[PDB]
Ligand binder design. Structure first.
Ligand SMILES: [Ca+2]
Ligand SMILES: [Ca+2]
Ligand SMILES: [Cl-]
Length: 294
DNA sequence: GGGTTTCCACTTATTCATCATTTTAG
DNA sequence: CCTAAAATGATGAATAAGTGGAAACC
């Protein structure tokens, strides 16, 4: 089941990461060795996702990242041409696009073997200064005259539902909310669909309302950090707008199981079973084995 | 063969995913 | 009164991003 290209790009927009290493080295002529590529680090439970991407691209290496995480790292230079070809045809739409554009400029440098010359390294430092978290303190000290062009902010729209499926497979969450009460059955079942993302992509998060015709944005905070949360709680919207989208565009990873259990609860709610004692017991049993409970 | 590339074990701060009670809407 | 929907209030950790060391390679 080779992963769909757009589903792969949506997943890369969520958990992808481009890397450009500029390491001190005595065994190098210009006194610096480099390493370029793209990586994905997931929990061990979704190692199959990495194995599928590796098999779909016929590129990349897989290794453990601790006792609870796996990573797909592709740094073989000629193998980076598969990455560029994919993202040229199926482009990223988050701020990570700016990181991919720098990753390409770095590829063009190393393809010419300029990274072996001094000016090539000065150019790669130029590019790395705007990539991800920027230059290290050691590099800043080694390149005090470094001057990089301004990095313009990204703003792209959701291309199709395949991308949304891939992005939701990484950032999404399907939740069965058991609103306790001193009522008849004592519990009100409420399905919830959440997508979380940093505020730096507020435009993309805000567009979800019009793209899916439902939901609302909630601003969250934690320490000095903050992020947005696209949420859907109206059952009719969940049953008619959210569920049909991810059934026609299949999710990947373990979250597909949580989505399938999520849909079974929707079927019982649609049939008014959530208002009966036995039906409520089934909703609970389903919730026990979802998400962290699986 | 020696500079360079590639792999592999390993680390870390926070943006994620996931959590649930309380309140309001209809 | 009864049920649905939203608002409120919360945090552990799977992420994104990075690093050390050296075998593989051309
Ligand atoms: Ca992300
Ligand atoms: Ca994820
Ligand atoms: Cl549309």
């Amino acid at each position: 089941e080779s992963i769909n290209p757009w589903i792969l790009t949506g997943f890369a927009d969520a958990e992808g990461s481009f890397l450009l290493r500029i390491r001190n080295n005595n065994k190098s002529s210009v006194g610096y060795s480099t390493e370029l590529g793209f990586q994905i680090t997931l929990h061990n439970k979704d190692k199959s996702i990495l194995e599928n991407i590796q098999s779909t691209w016929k590129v990349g290496v897989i290794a453990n990242s601790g006792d609870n995480a796996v990573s797909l790292k592709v740094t073989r230079f000629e193998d980076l041409k598969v990455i560029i070809d994919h993202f040229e045809k199926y482009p990223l739409i988050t701020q990570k696009l700016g990181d991919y554009k720098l990753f390409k400029q770095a590829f063009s440098v190393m393809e010419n073997k300029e990274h072996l010359k001094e000016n090539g390294i000065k150019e790669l430092v130029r590019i790395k200064a705007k990539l991800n978290w920027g230059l290290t303190d050691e590099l800043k000290k080694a390149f005090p005259e470094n001057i990089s062009k301004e990095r313009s902010l990204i703003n792209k729209n959701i291309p199709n539902f395949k991308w949304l499926a891939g992005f939701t497979s990484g950032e999404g969450s399907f939740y069965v909310n058991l609103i306790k009460s001193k009522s008849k059955l004592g519990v009100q079942v409420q399905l919830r669909f959440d997508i979380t993302q940093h505020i730096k992509d507020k435009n993309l998060m805000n567009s979800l309302i019009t793209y899916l015709g439902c939901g609302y944005i909630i601003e969250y905070n934690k320490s000095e950090f903050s992020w947005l949360n696209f949420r859907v709680t109206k059952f009719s919207d969940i049953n008619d707008k959210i569920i049909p989208v991810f059934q026609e565009n299949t999710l990947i990873g373990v979250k597909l199981e949580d989505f399938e259990d999520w849909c079974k609860v929707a079927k019982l709610i649609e049939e008014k079973k959530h208002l009966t004692e036995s039906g409520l017991d089934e909703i609970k049993k389903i919730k026990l084995n979802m998400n962290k409970g699986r």
